[PDB]
Design a protein around this ligand. Structure first.
Ligand SMILES: NCc1ccc(C[C@@H](CP(=O)(O)[C@@H](N)CCc2ccccc2)C(=O)O)cc1
Ligand SMILES: NCc1ccc(C[C@H](CP(=O)(O)[C@@H](N)CCc2ccccc2)C(=O)O)cc1
Ligand SMILES: [Zn+2]
Length: 866
């Protein structure tokens, strides 16, 4: 009987912890942790149960050796006082042996922590659940020369020196917090200092800690933080609440970053950049993630989660906030489409697959398996629907009441929903289903103009998922407009208002919406701004789609029209390839693309999106008995056709873009848009004319004016069977051998190549001196990329499956989190054609047969196999 955790079983804790006093004595190799916990009975007389997995040296209750039992990862004391009492725990840790990167661990000769969700119990024995909030004071003692920088949450209130070369510090964090927000750093790190003055007039000292060599790359992150601090004030009315804000970069880290109170810890990938070594996308990522972690100070820290089932309470909302921040900075419509594309490419397959779950899960075995596209990105779409239904002003009324009610509390998704409802005086009961029902809703829509009424009928359905069969009608906002035969906006009457746009609120299984006062023939524009996270089916002709693409006023619906045209073209390719005949002409598609190419009024980055073809996973959505190589072949044929058909115009557009970039090689949204278009053109050019690689190689130094250009060119040639591709990659690795984030790029190119020899190049790269399997960035770059490399992962001989299964098994021995993400490469199992399905099931059974397989990987494998 494995342990499953159920949301229905939630009970308030028997004990609170009012004060948490910690002492870290850092030595070589061991660190000894001492605690003093001030414990307050809630249900008097129950046993005290503490979570913990660190080596236990001693435990006391009010200063006397406790009578306790340690079983598994729980410490229990039966005899506890009926009033306030203390518990003192002594544990010992070997951080350099901690390759899980959870708890207290070594990286680069320094010490770091990661406690979310349940890592604090790897440091000491504790009531390690987020509804237990305590006031932390942390003392740290270490060798001064080896560990001159000693940090923990909050305010530094004392410190000093010892005559043996050791020194110490004491940090007090005055805001009661759950254990998952604890952090400690001890190291030889360089500091970059700055400050921000809050709107109430208080300076906040900003400190970024990096390696000495990395310091010159942290400046954009600092600027981004100051931008995020100002934005939370101007957009949400939220001010920071300490006079110190620390950010620490670490090269070994499971995820992107972590919002520990006043002491955020970041993957280097999301804090370090310069134009020589980071792409524009990398800069955008730093801006997004620095914003994200700062926004958590209110949405996550000041108001936290009652239990881990409520994770989206903080993550969906903080993602919405980071999206809005980025959109307010620049390029809102393009960035919105990027977010939608990410959701459909990665979250929609999750909701269609064996690991599908609601935004608020009802159960889990291992909580680290639920830091998902669903909880984050669908979670953010759910928050955004409040904004769509209520408007910005109403949304901010909800936010204000949320903090009024729940500042200092650990609360639920329901509480956020109630604040939105109550602040605006409306009923959002049906909205709750966005949290409890998994799966992507499918809307079927039909339209007719009768009299002068456009009647839009819309049906909704939500498929069963493995957790739940019954799915009731949901509250689904559908933003619409109407175009006449010349693509002009057409007004209409709805709920006693004449406008060119309206939000139709679908709440029943099937409804008809009457758009009245329509005096011209129309084609509707539907789901504007991607107004709900759904699949929408409407009968559009190719000519309707061309109209929408050419003339609609909404970015998403224009882009979705192009996407539909590409999808239909791939489907036509599939049919001809299957019937063994000539490829289709795609005459209408090609006319549409020529128009996009030649339109000088189109925003550059938007034009780039209109020229992107949906991924293989998008293309086989909803299919059974999938042969991934047949979809790959149909998609590649389309790209080949686009590349060759328009080769001169790809060169021409590249030149236009280069001229407009105007040698402005530093990061800016404007220059970046031109580079994005430039890199689309390069990809098409080198597909049509692979020999152009020698021309690029001859002038490489001249083209390599920043990393966006180097990455764009290497990406464009990465599938080229020329030896020059291999030489350019080798030269790249040599040039940048000292920059670990650039080496990640090298390994991603190795892993992602559609060349025939990628598996053996990947196996050589495993032994590259700069590769480390125990580093998540490296493992994700090489092995993760390979697992997403459709022709290689899904090779008919099963070599891709065997390779990835081998690496899941190996990585799980030291980092179950990385292994459990990797093993989801197999999630398509039950939808594959029989030969591959058989091989994937063999691979999964072999993983399952491993002695000592983690709960993390076992939970995923069980969902796929069983
Ligand atoms: N309601 C329970 C609670 C609330 C707030 C706290 C927080 C503590 C924080 P603190 O003592 O370090 C205060 N001096 C910081 C003021 C400031 C703000 C912004 C910029 C610069 C300086 C408090 O402000 O008292 C602690 C507990
Ligand atoms: N624009 C979308 C977006 C999504 C997420 C982010 C940031 C996100 C980090 P996060 O703030 O959610 C953090 N609470 C994850 C916990 C964790 C950390 C390490 C190990 C286990 C658990 C990331 O990982 O990047 C930032 C932006
Ligand atoms: Zn987050």
């Amino acid at each position: 009987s494995k342990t499953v955790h159920y949301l229905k079983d939630y009970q308030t804790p028997a004990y609170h912890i009012l004060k948490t006093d910690l002492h870290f004595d850092i030595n070589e190799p061991q660190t000894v942790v001492k605690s003093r916990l001030t414990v307050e009975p809630q249900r008097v007389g129950e046993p005290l149960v503490l979570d913990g997995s660190a080596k236990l040296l001693s435990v006391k209750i009010n200063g006397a050796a406790a009578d306790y039992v340690l079983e598994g990862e729980t410490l229990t004391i039966a005899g506890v006082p009926s009033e306030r009492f203390t518990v003192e725990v002594e544990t010992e840790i070997l951080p350099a042996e901690n390759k899980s990167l959870m708890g207290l661990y070594a990286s680069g000769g320094n010490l770091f922590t990661q406690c979310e969700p349940e890592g604090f119990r790897k440091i000491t024995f504790y009531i390690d659940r987020p509804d237990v909030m305590s006031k932390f004071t942390t003392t740290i003692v270490a060798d001064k020369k080896r560990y001159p920088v000693l940090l923990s949450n909050g305010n530094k209130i004392d410190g000093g020196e010892f005559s043996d070369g050791r020194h110490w510090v004491k940090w007090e964090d005055p805001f009661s917090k759950p254990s998952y927000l604890f952090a400690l750093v001890a190291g030889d790190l360089a500091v970059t200092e700055d400050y921000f003055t809050t709107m109430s007039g208080r300076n906040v000292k900003i400190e970024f800690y990096t390696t000495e060599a990395d310091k010159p790359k942290v400046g954009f992150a600092v600027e981004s933080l100051k931008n995020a601090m100002k934005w939370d004030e101007t957009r949400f009315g939220l001010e920071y609440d300490l006079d110190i804000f620390m950010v620490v970069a670490v090269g070994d880290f499971n995820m992107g970053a972590m919002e520990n109170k006043g002491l955020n810890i970041f993957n280097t990938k999301f804090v370090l950049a310069d134009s020589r070594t980071a792409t524009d996308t990398d800069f955008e990522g730093i801006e997004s993630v620095v914003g994200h972690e700062y926004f958590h100070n209110w949405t996550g820290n000041r108001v936290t989660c009652r239990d881990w089932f409520q994770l989206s309470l903080k993550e969906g909302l903080t993602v919405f906030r980071d999206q809005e921040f980025s959109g307010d900075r620049a390029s809102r419509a393009v960035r919105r489409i990027e977010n939608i594309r990410l959701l459909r490419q990665h979250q929609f397959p999750e909701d269609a697959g064996p690991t599908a779950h609601p935004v608020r899960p009802a159960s889990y075995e291992e909580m680290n398996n639920f830091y998902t596209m669903t909880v984050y990105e669908k979670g953010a779409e759910v928050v955004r629907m409040y904004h769509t239904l209520l408007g910005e002003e109403g949304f901010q009324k909800g936010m204000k009441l949320y903090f009024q009610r729940h500042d200092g509390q650990a609360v639920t998704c329901d509480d956020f929903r109630a604040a939105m409802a109550d602040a605006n005086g409306i009923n959002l009961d049906q909205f709750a289903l966005w949290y409890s029902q998994a799966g992507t809703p499918v809307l079927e829509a039909e339209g007719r103009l009768k009299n002068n009424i456009f009647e839009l009928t819309v049906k909704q359905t939500v498929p069963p998922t493995p957790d739940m069969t019954d799915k009731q009608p949901m509250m689904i906002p559908v933003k619409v407009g109407l175009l006449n035969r010349n693509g002009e906006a057409v007004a209409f009457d709805y709920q006693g208002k004449r406008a060119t746009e309206a939000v139709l609120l679908l709440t029943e299984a099937e409804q008809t919406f009457l758009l009245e006062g329509v005096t011209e023939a129309v084609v509707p524009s539907l789901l504007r701004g991607f107004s709900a996270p759904v699949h929408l089916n409407y009968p559009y002709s190719d000519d309707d789609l061309l109209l929408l693409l050419a003339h609609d006023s909404d970015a998403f619906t224009r882009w979705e029209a192009a996407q539909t045209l590409y999808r239909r073209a791939v489907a036509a390719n599939l049919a001809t390839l299957s019937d063994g005949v000539e490829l289709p002409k795609h005459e209408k598609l090609l006319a549409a693309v020529e128009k996009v190419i030649s339109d000088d009024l189109l925003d550059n980055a938007f034009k780039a999106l209109l020229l992107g073809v949906p991924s293989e996973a998008e293309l086989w959505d909803g299919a059974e008995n999938i042969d991934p190589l047949r979809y790959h072949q149909a998609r590649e044929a389309l790209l080949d056709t686009l590349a060759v058909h328009f080769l001169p115009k790809w060169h021409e557009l590249n030149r236009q873009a280069a001229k407009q970039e105007n040698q402005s090689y530093e990061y800016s949204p404007e220059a970046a848009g031109w580079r994005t278009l430039r890199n689309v053109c390069r990809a098409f050019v080198l597909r049509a004319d692979p020999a152009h690689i020698e021309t690029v190689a001859e002038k490489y130094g001249e083209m390599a004016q920043n990393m966006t250009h180097e990455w764009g060119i290497l990406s464009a040639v990465n599938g080229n069977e020329s030896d020059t591709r291999n030489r350019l990659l080798a030269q790249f690795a040599d040039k940048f051998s000292d920059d670990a984030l650039v080496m990640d790029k090298y390994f991603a190119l190795v892993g992602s190549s559609r060349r025939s020899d990628t598996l053996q190049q990947v196996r050589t790269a495993l032994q590259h001196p700069k590769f480390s399997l125990e580093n998540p960035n490296k493992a994700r770059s090489l092995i993760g990329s390979f697992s997403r490399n459709v022709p290689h992962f899904h090779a008919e001989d099963g070599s891709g499956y065997r390779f990835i299964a081998d690496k899941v098994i190996e990585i799980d021995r030291f980092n179950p989190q990385v292994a459990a993400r990797l093993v989801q490469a197999f999630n398509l199992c039950n939808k594959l054609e029989p030969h591959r399905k058989n091989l994937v099931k063999q691979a999964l059974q072999r993983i399952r047969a491993q002695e000592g397989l983690s709960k993390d990987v076992g939970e995923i494998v069980g969902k796929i196999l069983d």
